[PDB]
């Protein structure tokens, strides 16, 4: 029995009511939106910054002189030298050319396998170039020590000692191992529950690594083009070999080191196979201690987990009571806490909680102390934080006693 609306009904509904100010307000809103759009269009620039130096820095009219005189040179590698000598040059992907040197360079300068520049017209070799240093692989280095030391890692004395015996002791004091004929393990696989502190130990090692520390970004190794990830792994391991006693950290190794299956991952599997032979196989790896971490060790290919590539498998178990107390002290060193805080009770109230949950509890206690305007967080704040962080995420406890 419902009846549809007509034109007169619509008109009366939109008129029979409030019309003394509704029309004016609606028009004002529409025109305010229009004015905002007009202003945005009028400015609508946000001039994007470009690398233009200060006016005095360049102030050069000879830049045109160098542009007109100097000529761009394609970079290519001389695969072979022919004997007037002729040179076979691979212009990356363009084509293969058989060119001869320009008078500027001497024949002795150009050697087989060296990447040299060539003119865009005749392809003559004009100048040698330093061997390629990959930009992503080079940026994969640390060159900035994180500010987390071994004193910030608590409850893992045995694990930390094993990690040092793997990545630090063999580098600092090779004599203790050479005298007894002991080859120190070259790799460590830090596997444990998430938030237990593997990455913290890795950061501590990088902090006191006193060598080349390379953090392997799982994103770069997985590349869009086929064969690019294996090339990146091969470049990273070469850059590690050129240095002395390098340290490679394969964070979240389960990102690429999945179990092979029969297209599936395929390309990532090829990159994994490239890392496997680099770590172990022909052509000994050298002084490159590999550090791998993963919260899910069961998905790794058995080849990558075999004790020839990851020699020492450190298990980062949930901290025991002493470990939890030490973690609480470490994370509460800066907190303005009262002097009677029984950290033992807070440790015993977090039965199975990693270091990350302990830090969360400490931050929650601080936030509770901030809620009520108190600058000192009493033990009651810590108890409430423990309830909120662990217990939050009676009849069941009734049976127990």
């Amino acid at each position: 029995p419902i009846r549809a609306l007509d034109e007169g009904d619509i008109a009366l509904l939109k008129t029979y009511g409030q019309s003394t100010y509704s029309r004016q307000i609606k028009q004002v809103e529409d025109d305010i939106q229009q004015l905002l759009k007009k202003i945005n269009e009028l400015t609508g620039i946000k001039e994007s910054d470009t690398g233009l130096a200060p006016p005095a820095l360049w102030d050069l009219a000879a830049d045109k002189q160098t542009l007109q005189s100097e000529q761009p040179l394609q970079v290519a590698r001389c695969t072979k030298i022919i004997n007037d000598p002729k040179y076979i040059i691979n212009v990356k992907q363009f084509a293969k050319f058989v060119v001869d040197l320009s008078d500027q360079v001497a024949p002795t300068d150009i050697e087989e396998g060296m990447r040299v520049g060539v003119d865009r017209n005749k392809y003559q070799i004009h100048i040698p170039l330093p061997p390629k240093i990959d930009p992503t692989v080079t940026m994969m280095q640390v060159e900035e020590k994180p500010d987390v030391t071994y004193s910030d890692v608590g409850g893992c004395k045995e694990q930390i000692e094993k990690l040092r015996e793997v990545v630090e002791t063999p580098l600092l004091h090779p004599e203790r191992f050479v005298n007894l004929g002991i080859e120190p393990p070259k790799g460590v696989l830090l596997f444990g529950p998430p938030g237990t502190g593997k990455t913290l130990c890795a950061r501590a090692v990088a902090n006191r690594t006193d060598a080349c520390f390379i953090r392997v970004i799982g994103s770069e190794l997985v590349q869009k083009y086929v064969g690019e990830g294996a090339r990146m792994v091969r470049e990273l391991f070469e850059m590690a070999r050129t240095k002395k006693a390098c340290l490679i950290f394969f964070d979240e190794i389960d990102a690429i080191g999945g179990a092979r299956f029969d297209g599936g991952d395929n390309e990532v599997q090829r990159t994994m196979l490239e890392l496997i032979n680099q770590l172990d196989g022909f052509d000994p790896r050298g002084n490159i201690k590999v550090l791998m971490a993963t919260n899910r060790p069961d998905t790794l290919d058995p080849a990558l987990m075999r004790p020839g590539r990851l020699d020492r498998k450190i298990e980062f178990s949930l901290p025991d009571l002493e470990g939890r107390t030490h973690i609480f002290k470490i994370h509460a060193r800066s907190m303005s806490v009262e002097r009677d805080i029984r950290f033992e009770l807070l440790a015993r109230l977090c039965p199975n909680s990693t270091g990350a949950e302990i830090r969360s509890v400490c931050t929650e206690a601080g936030m509770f102390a901030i809620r009520a305007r108190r600058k000192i967080a009493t033990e009651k704040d810590f108890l409430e934080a423990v309830n909120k962080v662990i217990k939050s995420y009676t009849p069941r406890y009734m049976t127990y006693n």
């Binding site: 294996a230 091969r234 196989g281 022909f282 058995p302």
Partner: protein, 88 residues
């Protein structure tokens, strides 16, 4: 292979049948030849070393490379995969 890695067969343990098989199928036909042609028994063209990971396949390959005057030409599966079509 130009560094000629050193690994005597004594370093390989638990695989006496497999080491002999590889030597007779990859080495004996190599430096003898005319003898095999005498008996008219075709030597296998290749050896596929398959087994559980870490069994020592690459170790036997290294031992063969070290204790063989042949020109070992190592390579990896990932190495023969390149973006440019036909590069592999």
């Amino acid at each position: 292979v130009d560094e000629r890695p050193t690994e005597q067969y004594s370093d390989i343990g638990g695989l006496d049948k497999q080491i002999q098989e590889l030597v007779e199928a990859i080495v004996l036909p190599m430096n003898h030849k005319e003898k095999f042609e005498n008996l008219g028994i075709q030597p296998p063209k290749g050896v596929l070393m398959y087994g559980p990971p870490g069994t020592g396949k690459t170790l036997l390959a290294r031992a063969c490379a070290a204790q063989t005057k042949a020109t070992f030409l190592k390579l990896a599966g990932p190495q023969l995969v390149q973006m440019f079509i036909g590069d592999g």
